[PDB]
Structure formats: C-alpha cells, structure tokens
C-alpha cells in the first residue's frame, strides 16, 4: 500500500506524457507495470531462495514469502489506485500546490 501509493507520483509528473491530458492515466499505468515487474522479481526470489517447509508464519519461508508477495501485489495495486483517485479528483495534487497561487 505504501510503496504502490507513492509510485504514481514521479511517473505522473515526469513521464513522457506529463504535458498531455492523459498524464495521470499514463502515470498510473506505468506504476502498475513497475508493480507487476517487482511482483515477478518477488516471485522468482521466493522460488530460488526457500525450501518447501510446513512453516508458513514467517517471512523467510516459501509459503510465507508467497503470502507476502500476494499481499504486496494487492496492496500495491490498491495504493496506486487510491493515489490515482485522489490526484484525479483534487486539483491541489494535480499542480502540486500551484493551484493556490
């Protein structure tokens, strides 16, 4: 939730579509692509790093890392979508404060 929420901002403000009317949509889509790439990284890390054990309540177990990866994917998508909603509906966030001037 935390990392996916803050991932939208740099893509929205500095991406190649930043001066277009679809800047936020492009930034959210770029954040989603980065999230999917990082989830693949998490998955292959867990595949090569952990042996299949009964223990599943710890992060450094195979089942525990799969649970952590699932939670990270769902939280990242949710946080990115929340940031998209807030920037879409609040003009203060679109201009990073310049709407007050």
């Amino acid at each position: 939730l935390t990392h996916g929420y803050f991932l939208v901002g740099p893509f929205y403000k500095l991406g190649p579509l930043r001066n277009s009317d679809v800047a936020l949509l492009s930034g959210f889509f770029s954040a989603l692509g980065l999230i999917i790439i990082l989830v693949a990284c998490l998955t292959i890390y867990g595949v090569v790093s952990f042996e299949e054990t009964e223990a599943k309540d710890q992060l450094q177990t195979a089942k525990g890392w799969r649970q952590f990866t699932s939670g990270w994917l769902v939280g990242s998508v949710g946080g990115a979508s929340f940031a998209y909603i807030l920037i879409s509906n609040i003009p203060f966030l679109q201009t990073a404060g310049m709407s007050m001037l």
């Binding site: 190649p16 579509l17 277009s20 009317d21 679809v22 492009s26 989603l32 999917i36 989830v39 998955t43 299949e52 990866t69 699932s70 939670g71 994917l73 769902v74 998508v77």
Partner: protein
C-alpha cells in the same frame, strides 16, 4: 515446470480451455458491438501529440492506431490485470494456475470424460476443448478465405449479430 502443472498437462488444458471459451465469447461480442457501431469513434485515429509514440503504426494514411483497436486492447488489459492478480493472489477456493511441487495431477480424461452435465469439471473440459477447436477453425476459415474474423463469425452464425 512439468511438476508445477505447465506444459502438456490436464491443468494447462483446463486453463487454456477456460481462456478459449472466454475468447469465443469475446470474439462474438466484438463482432456484435462492431456490427452495431457501439464502439464510440471507432474510426478515429489516435494522435501522437496526446498518446505519445506508442500510438504510431506507420500505415499508409494516418500513422496511428484506430480508437476501436485501442479500446479492444484496454478491454483485454482489464482482464490481464485480473489474470495477474489471480495468478499471484488466487482465491482460497479457486483452482490455481501453478501447482505445488508435491501436487496430485488430475487424471487425463481421454477421448471424452464421463458425461456429467452441469457445472462439473467434465463439462468444463469438454466445452473448453470444443472452444479451442472452434478458435482453430475460425482462424483457418478466416485466413483461407480473406473474410474478416468478425465477418466469419457473423456468417457462421448466419448474420444473427448484424
């Protein structure tokens, strides 16, 4: 690989059958929506000044992707995101895409599984194999005749859609 349900397995046959049944549905609905003109501004060429260099196609006129093709791709993007989340974070009851290393493979159904009508895995596998074969047949009938795939579906359903 093969110990996780990938390759020539019954798991992969079931998953590709599900995706092919959905694909037949999506092709029929695409033919219906395009025939009735229900895709808004379908012949509008997307401009590079708004959507960037990803919209460039380099055809002979316009050099841009049509709005209908972009809309169809975004419709596919929705279910692709659903696909990624279901593959990484499946429902607790749901059949999984990748299986654990010590899993029990489903027995191959042979020529035809036992004739269990309803919301049974046998009916799912039968209609899935049928849909995969139908996609093969529709593609071959489209490329051996020059008829567009939406039009090939519309003739094969006897102009019901449009």
């Amino acid at each position: 690989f093969g110990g996780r349900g990938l390759g020539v397995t019954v798991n992969a046959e079931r998953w590709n059958g599900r995706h092919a049944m959905f694909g037949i549905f999506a092709m029929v609905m695409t033919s219906y929506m395009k025939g009735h003109g229900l895709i808004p501004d379908a012949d509008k060429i997307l401009d590079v000044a708004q959507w960037g260099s990803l919209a460039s196609v380099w055809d002979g006129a316009g050099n841009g992707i049509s709005n209908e093709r972009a809309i169809i791709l975004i419709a596919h993007v929705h279910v692709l995101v659903v696909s990624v989340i279901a593959a990484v974070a499946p429902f607790g009851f749901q059949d999984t895409l990748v299986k654990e290393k010590g899993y029990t493979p489903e027995a191959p159904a042979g020529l035809i599984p036992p004739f269990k009508t309803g919301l049974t895995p046998e009916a799912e596998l039968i209609n899935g194999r049928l849909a995969m074969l139908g996609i093969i047949s529709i593609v071959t009938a489209s490329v051996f005749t020059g008829t567009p795939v939406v039009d090939t579906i519309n003739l094969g359903m006897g102009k019901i859609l449009y």
